[PDB]
Amino acid sequence: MRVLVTGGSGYIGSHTCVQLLQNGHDVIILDNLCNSKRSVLPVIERLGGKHPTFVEGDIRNEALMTEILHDHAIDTVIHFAGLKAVGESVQKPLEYYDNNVNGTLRLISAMRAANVKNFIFSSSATVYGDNPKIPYVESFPTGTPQSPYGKSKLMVEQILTDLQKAQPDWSIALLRYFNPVGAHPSGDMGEDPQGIPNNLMPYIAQVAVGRRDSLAIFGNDYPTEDGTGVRDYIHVMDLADGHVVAMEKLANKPGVHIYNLGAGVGNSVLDVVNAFSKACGKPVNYHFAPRREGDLPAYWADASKADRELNWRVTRTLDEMAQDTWHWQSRHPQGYPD
Amino acid sequence: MRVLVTGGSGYIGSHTCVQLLQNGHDVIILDNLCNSKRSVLPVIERLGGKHPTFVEGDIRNEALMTEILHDHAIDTVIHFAGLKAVGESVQKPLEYYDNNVNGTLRLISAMRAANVKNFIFSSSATVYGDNPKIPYVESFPTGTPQSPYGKSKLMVEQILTDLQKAQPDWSIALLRYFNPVGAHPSGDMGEDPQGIPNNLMPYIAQVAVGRRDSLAIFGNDYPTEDGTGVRDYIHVMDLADGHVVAMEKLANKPGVHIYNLGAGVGNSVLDVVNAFSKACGKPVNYHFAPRREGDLPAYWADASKADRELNWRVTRTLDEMAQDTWHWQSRHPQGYPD
Ligand SMILES: NC(=O)c1ccc[n+]([C@@H]2O[C@H](COP(=O)([O-])OP(=O)(O)OC[C@H]3O[C@@H](n4cnc5c(N)ncnc54)[C@H](O)[C@@H]3O)[C@@H](O)[C@H]2O)c1
Ligand SMILES: NC(=O)c1ccc[n+]([C@@H]2O[C@H](COP(=O)([O-])OP(=O)(O)OC[C@H]3O[C@@H](n4cnc5c(N)ncnc54)[C@H](O)[C@@H]3O)[C@@H](O)[C@H]2O)c1
Ligand SMILES: O=c1ccn([C@@H]2O[C@H](COP(=O)(O)OP(=O)(O)O)[C@@H](O)[C@H]2O)c(=O)[nH]1
Ligand SMILES: O=c1ccn([C@@H]2O[C@H](COP(=O)(O)OP(=O)(O)O)[C@@H](O)[C@H]2O)c(=O)[nH]1
Ligand code: NA
Ligand code: NA
Ligand code: NA
Ligand code: NA
């Protein structure tokens, strides 16, 4: 099929585009380059073994969206474009609501004008909010997200939901995930944070590489097996796969299809650090700090539904996530070239 | 002070502008005329005894908002502009999210660029969602609104809340109200629905006037004194007053100030009908229907906080709401002139 991939040049999107091309689909990437570089493009092509069209632009530009949609006879849209730095979200709320909330609204509005009715949304497991019932299941009602980032994701979910109700021919997937990590096995694509990495893995990778001194472990007091925070980590390649399957299997199947994408088990901070020490061949330096603002002791996704309904499940291990990361970090220390 | 009143030519806004002018404030009205007519303008001036500047335009146009803000040296903004038809909201969700969510975001963004930090938001008591704890108190956490309309209001509240947190110098009021009714005592301004009136009072007024056959009373089965739905009705003049006070008393007082605006008591459907039969001098025709989609047996606002903190409370009665309505309906059967 003909797919428009917003945010396609970013971390998850790039990986997804390669898998898409490999499946022989026609790929149109829409990205504003606010958090990615044109240099990834040729890598996508190479790895994908096919040429994806690239359009520089913003989801907030409804006019352009409609043009693109029409110009390329788009059948489906996988939407990864947006802002995702939780801490930044607290400091710059408006920017998050605009890019995420308004950004998606402008996009779906254009789809409406262009008669495109298949959509796959990059959601987030932060929508579950404060849930003492873990792991999280899709049948669980959502809660109230802690940050402007989380709130914007639920807001979008709600909007798409009402939309589908008003325009029942629409097929919409809400893909909820936690912590994506790893990189393409080639070691030639991966996560390329500009500045202080947000997530654990990359941060740790930076500590490993020499860039950082020590990892601060926020809380060693939790009601967990080792006292540190337990989270769900999913390999980026598996995530990308889940995206392709969802897109192929749900196209033209009316409704709001909610699926948690994850390994179905949790891992502590120490578990992640040990995995990494192992992958990079040297002890990762860390120290303990006291509980970070807004964090919970432990949570993960129940991914039975996707297994059952989409026949999808993870295949990569925590160790591979680490190795893959180390590999990319190692082959391309300066990330993507400017 | 210099105040920008978005949606100022509509029902509540017009009333509010008159009270504003009377208080000697400088009023700039911003309206897109999607639900009001230029003809109300001269009435505003007359009743207000002062000239308000009028600008035709849309809140979604950030550029214009900023211009306006700067051009007039705005000190505070009272925001009534938006869409509010609940049933229409279910049928046309996008339009509601755009006008309400995006609409406010564009407006506050402009304020940001123009260095305007005092805001009064026309909120809604639908934000309380499904609350079996009545009456509703501001200390109660919000729930999940039933319609796209309700959801958009809570979304806006959430956005303004995070904003204030990131820009602590801002003063923001969230004014939660239920069912505004009545009209200016002059009988020369009032609610002018185009088409099938949404709310009870006006609908009933139309039945009275001859336009409608009978009022359908959705449910006579409720756990209420008379079996019909109990709601909170607030006279439009009192609402307008609450708006002025909030604006004058909260300007430059940092924080998110939440206040329920209401009478503090509930009235059933039959109560409203009887009140109206009485005001128009003739039995209002009605019949019973079974429970409308999404409605609850009874709810109202606890307005102690406003009384205490703002020294504000209603002064008009249900009977006046009815009389005033009948009066306007009677002096101007064709509403505002085109
Ligand atoms: N990265 C994560 O850890 C994570 C976790 C949960 C959910 N998600 C969701 O996945 C999506 C992308 O995540 P990611 O990890 O690939 O991050 P990313 O920054 O690498 O990729 C997003 C891409 O979108 C682009 N973009 C941002 N705003 C845009 C706009 N207004 N118009 C056009 N392009 C725009 C950026 O330039 C970047 O290339 C977002 O929906 C995010 O909320 C990601
Ligand atoms: N009317 C009610 O029953 C009610 C109940 C609860 C909350 N509220 C809130 O009060 C506000 C106004 O209520 P109202 O009763 O006066 O209705 P209204 O339609 O009479 O007034 C709103 C006005 O806003 C204008 N407008 C709408 N969208 C606009 C946009 N995008 N840009 C510029 N102007 C725009 C319309 O032309 C109209 O003049 C809204 O915030 C509504 O949610 C109203
Ligand atoms: O410098 C860091 C970054 C992350 N974490 C922990 O690593 C886990 C994964 O968090 P991250 O921010 O990567 O994602 P989250 O699970 O909050 O999305 C959480 O328990 C964080 O508490 C940590 O201790 N130090
Ligand atoms: O044609 C109508 C319109 C309204 N109502 C009732 O009048 C009350 C006020 O409802 P409205 O739509 O005016 O506002 P709500 O309280 O739902 O905002 C509610 O119990 C409605 O059930 C009714 O029975 N028939
Ligand atoms: Na419909
Ligand atoms: Na670099
Ligand atoms: Na801050
Ligand atoms: Na008329």
UniProtKB/Swiss-Prot annotation, chains A, B:
Organism whose genome encodes this protein: Escherichia coli (strain K12)
Family: Belongs to the NAD(P)-dependent epimerase/dehydratase family.
Binding partners and assembly: Homodimer.
Residues of the active site: Y149
Name of the molecule in the record: UDP-glucose 4-epimerase
Catalytic activity: UDP-alpha-D-glucose = UDP-alpha-D-galactose
Function: Involved in the metabolism of galactose. Catalyzes the conversion of UDP-galactose (UDP-Gal) to UDP-glucose (UDP-Glc) through a mechanism involving the transient reduction of NAD. It is only active on UDP-galactose and UDP-glucose.
PANTHER family (UniProt xref): UDP-GLUCOSE 4-EPIMERASE
Induction: By D-galactose and D-fucose.
A biological-process GO annotation: colanic acid biosynthetic process
Domain of life: Bacteria
Effect of Y149F: No major structural changes. Catalytic efficiency is very low and affinity binding is 12% of the wild-type enzyme
Keyword field contains Lyase: no
Annotated metabolic or biological route of this protein: Carbohydrate metabolism; galactose metabolism
EC number annotated for this UniProt entry: 5.1.3.2
Keyword NAD: yes
GO molecular function, one term: identical protein binding
Outcome, altering Y299C: Loss of epimerase activity with UDP-Gal by almost 5-fold, but it results in a gain of epimerase activity with uridine diphosphate N-acetylglucosamine (UDP-GlcNAc) by 230-fold with minimal changes in its three-dimensional structure
Keywords: Carbohydrate metabolism, Galactose metabolism, Isomerase, NAD
Gene this protein is translated from: galE
Residues that coordinate or bind NAD(+): 11-12, 31-36, 58-59, 80-84, 99, 124, 149, 153, 178
Gene Ontology cellular-component terms listed: cytoplasm; cytosol
Cofactor(s) it depends on: NAD(+)
Binding site for substrate: S124, Y149, N179, N199, L200, A216, I217, F218, R231, R292, E293, G294, D295, Y299
Documented activity regulation: Inhibited by UDP-phenol and NaBH3CN.
Effect of S124A: No major structural changes. Catalytic efficiency is very low and affinity binding is 21% of the wild-type enzyme
